[PDB]
Ligand binder design. Structure first.
Ligand code: HEM
Ligand SMILES: c1ccc2c3c([nH]c2c1)CNCC3
Length: 394
């Protein structure tokens, strides 16, 4: 082997930060033969890749996502189609749809809190976040909460297919079974929704028109599964990371309590510091070179969002959690936790709003919060988060 530091070394998933530092400095466009892809670790190169959709396109997501999405996902689209359908999805989490949704998500949040408040402790990952995330996503889409437990199971199986690189044949078949079950559950709901429209995102997709042409039913399912997958996975992770980092920095935690407005900045810093979506793949459409590393048409580049967001060329003291960062005082950049360019996260504004509502309610109702999980264990290299994050309260 010419190089000996691999993304797939056991040590990387345990703690990738030393890998970030090594790759940015000594191998910014790093080849991994096991998946025939290059890993891009620097902020400047990640930004360039994401801002140039013509040179680095999203056709990678066709083999990595479509087998379980059952049809085309928003990432695969381009031009006016991508723009119009992205705008249709944003409609479901803005305007009056957002005004109606937020009280519901408040209800979801207080219902979970009410289930745990007498135990004087709660696992932000396993008690709150995993439950809230999938319920919030079902509410956004318009899915009734009766079967949220199975929805979570099937979601986990589909997400594993998207976030994994070396799945065995029994893992693949299970993920596909999960995909079939979710489709078998959702297709009827789309059918009933179109004969009796409501004010949810599934109804938006059914009523969308592009020159009198309606979206096919399987595409509505794929877009619905895209939103379910996309909206669930990062929520539990980011909420856990947020309270963990605050509790591990008590002065910053006290600052958030005194000035509640700082919560938004704490969420943004959390997303930068512990990027829950770690990797964004792209396919190279033509010969290209970064530094002196040559890329050919058809090659795969994988942006390392966490590494970029800790690039010393973009942030001063990048490996320190600091909610008071700002371009008004040092080095500070716009983080890439939501991506950038054409395919930047449609859910970004909603996510920030939803996460602020939950954080404020947790701080309001759980008094004198204390950390019990003194040391987190993180899992995942594509999406990443703590396994557990238990807090205690009065
Ligand atoms: C903390 C929460 C979230 C984070 C960190 C996050 C992160 C990201 C990133 C990094 C991308 C770019 C992917 C790429 O360029 O290939 C993306 C895209 C996307 N996200 Fe999110 N996301 C979050 C929440 C959400 C939510 C709540 C929704 C929907 C309700 C959503 C739906 C989407 C969609 C549809 C895209 C594709 C955008 C496009 O192709 O134009 N995400 N997200
Ligand atoms: C794989 C697993 C999860 C995700 C999410 C996005 N892409 C993914 C790929 C973008 N939206 C946020 C969630």
């Amino acid at each position: 082997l010419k190089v000996y530091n691999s993304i797939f070394d056991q040590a990387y998933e345990i703690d990738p930060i030393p890998y970030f530092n090594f790759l940015r400095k000594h191998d910014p466009v790093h080849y991994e033969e096991s998946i025939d892809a290059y890993f891009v670790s620097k902020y400047k190169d990640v930004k360039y890749i994401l801002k140039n959709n013509d040179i680095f396109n999203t056709k990678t997501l066709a083999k990595r996502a479509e087998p379980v999405m059952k049809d085309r996902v928003l990432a695969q689209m381009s031009g006016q189609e991508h723009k119009s359908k992205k705008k249709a999805i944003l409609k479901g989490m803005t305007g009056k749809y957002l005004e109606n949704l937020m009280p519901i998500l408040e209800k979801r949040t207080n219902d979970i809190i009410n289930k745990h408040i007498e135990k004087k402790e709660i696992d932000i990952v396993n008690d709150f976040g995993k439950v809230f995330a999938v319920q919030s996503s079902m509410d956004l889409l318009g899915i009734n909460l009766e079967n949220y437990e199975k929805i979570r199971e099937w979601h986990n199986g589909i997400a594993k297919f998207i976030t994994s690189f070396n799945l065995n044949d029994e893992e693949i078949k299970y993920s596909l079974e999960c995909s079939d079950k979710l489709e078998n559950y959702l297709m009827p709901l789309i059918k009933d929704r179109k004969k009796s429209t409501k004010d949810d995102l599934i109804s938006i997709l059914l009523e969308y028109k592009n020159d009198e042409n309606s979206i096919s039913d399987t595409e509505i399912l794929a877009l619905s599964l895209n939103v379910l997958l996309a909206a669930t996975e990062p929520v539990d992770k980011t909420l856990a990371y947020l309270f963990y980092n605050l509790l591990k920095n008590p002065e910053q935690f006290e600052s958030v309590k005194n000035n509640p407005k700082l919560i938004k900045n704490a969420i943004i810093e959390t997303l930068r510091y512990n990027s829950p979506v770690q990797l964004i793949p792209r396919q190279v459409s033509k010969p290209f070179i970064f530094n002196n590393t040559e890329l050919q048409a058809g090659d795969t580049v994988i942006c390392m969002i966490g590494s970029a967001n800790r690039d010393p060329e973009a942030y001063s003291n990048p490996d320190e959690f600091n909610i008071h960062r700002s371009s008004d005082n040092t080095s500070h950049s716009q983080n890439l936790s939501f991506g950038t360019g054409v395919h930047t996260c449609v859910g970004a504004s909603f996510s920030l709003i939803q996460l602020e509502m939950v954080a404020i309610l947790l701080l309001k109702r759980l008094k004198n919060i204390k950390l019990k999980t003194m040391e987190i264990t993180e899992h995942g290299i594509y999406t990443r988060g703590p396994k557990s994050m238990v807090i205690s309260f009065d």
